[PDB]
Design a protein around this ligand. Sequence first.
Ligand code: OVJ
Length: 188
Amino acid sequence: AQYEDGKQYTTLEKPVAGAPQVLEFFSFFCPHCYQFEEVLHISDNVKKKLPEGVKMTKYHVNFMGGDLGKDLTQAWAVAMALGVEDKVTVPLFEGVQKTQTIRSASDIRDVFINAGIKGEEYDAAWNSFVVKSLVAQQEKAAADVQLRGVPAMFVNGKYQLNPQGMDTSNMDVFVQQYADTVKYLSEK
Ligand SMILES: COc1ccc(Nc2ccc3c(CC(=O)O)coc3c2)cc1
């Protein structure tokens, strides 16, 4: 077959009932995740290959970066609660990996302030139980699939994208192959 289990994708040994249709996991410490955001725009290109209105979910993970890695999962919960993901994704990636100006929770908060989120607004979200639940939700989704590597994408709780089986001599071909695979999996 053109698409084969073990090539462009793998099949979860224990499917995840009730999982989101397209689920991405990333870390702001993750070098390929930086590329998936700034150079490849994987999420945008996958969205354009799926039908209008399908839900795509993107969660942060704890297992990279120690203390700050957990602070970033909580900050990503704030970003989701406030709806400001598009305002903070690039500054957080660059603060961690390019300028290395993010060394503490205060530095993370600075990124949101500079992006125009009010201080009182950020701190109330940071300390809220709604954000505690969003942190728990991100942890539970990663736990459900025994996640040990990012960037990862899962389709309908059953299939995991295998980008190591995609050719990377041409970045646009790679993005297209990745998005076409998601579309194929979503239609199974
Ligand atoms: C800069 O553009 C790019 C970006 C990425 C790649 N290849 C690549 C290879 C392996 C993985 C894994 C699995 C893992 O190691 O956990 C996740 O994502 C990957 C991406 C090639 C070119």
